Amino acid sequence: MVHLTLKKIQAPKFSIEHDFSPSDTILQIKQHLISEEKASHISEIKLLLKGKVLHDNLFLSDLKVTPANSTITVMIKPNLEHHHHHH
Structure with a gap:
């Protein structure tokens, strides 16, 4: 029921x-x-659900992500410290 598709459009995006x-x-x-x-x-x-900022520990029973609104915007920015990336 509670279906969440996390679409990451930040970096490196996925x-x-x-x-x-x-x-x-x-x-x-x-x-x-x-x-x-x-x-x-x-x-x-x-x-984010429908532009609504979800908090770190928000319960999904309060969210109630319906399959019709299953598109979630996930904005993640990993620790790009360039240690292993820089040789």
Whole structure:
């Protein structure tokens, strides 16, 4: 039911999708993007639903992301410190 397609149009940009149960939190989704190295920290990930700023630990039962509004804008900016990238 609670279907969230996280489209990242920031840097280096990408498009992902996730499915979680309503009692899960934005923070868990964030921790997930961290754990899959798609981001640095929970807050460095901005999840927006219909232009609405979702908070770090917002519960999905309060969001109620309907399949009809499943398009999520995810603004993530990873730690581009250029250590491994710079040789």
